[PDB]
């Protein structure tokens, strides 16, 4: 309402907050859960109790803590 944008909410597929795990045979690392959805482009915003930490902040942008 404050910023006048419309929205549509969906739940994350695997129900995980998100960490970095290497692909199968020690290949490139990728993100799971909500972080992966945001990074890949399936979501434009993460509205959840997402903890701010260094590893996630290197890839996404956090707001001020609410």
């Amino acid at each position: 309402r404050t910023m006048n944008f419309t929205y549509e909410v969906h739940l994350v597929a695997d129900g995980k907050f998100g960490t970095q795990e290497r692909v199968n045979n020690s290949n490139k690392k990728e993100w799971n859960g909500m972080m992966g959805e945001l990074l890949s482009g399936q979501a434009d915003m993460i509205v959840a109790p997402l903890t701010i930490n260094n590893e996630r902040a290197q890839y996404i942008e956090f707001s001020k803590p609410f």
């Binding site: 129900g15 995980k16 907050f17 998100g18 960490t19 795990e21 799971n32 859960g33 109790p49 903890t51 930490n53 590893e55 996630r56």
Partner: protein
């Protein structure tokens, strides 16, 4: 800093949620390696399941957000 957590045993069972910020926190620390291994052996899929396990005496301690 409790010695029980720093000295894991089969009788005491403590864990957290998979693919979460607590996993990152315990993984990046080196002095928490034994606790990390013990937690990883018994990690739960979601917070609600871990709460239920704590109520049902299947899990002794659950480490999660304040």
């Amino acid at each position: 800093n409790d010695p029980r957590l720093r000295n894991p045993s089969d009788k005491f069972i403590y864990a957290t949620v998979k693919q979460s910020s607590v996993d990152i926190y315990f993984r990046r620390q080196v002095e928490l390696s034994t606790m990390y291994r013990h937690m990883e052996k018994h990690n739960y899929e979601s917070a609600a399941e871990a709460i239920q396990a704590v109520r049902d005496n299947k899990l002794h301690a659950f480490i999660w957000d304040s």
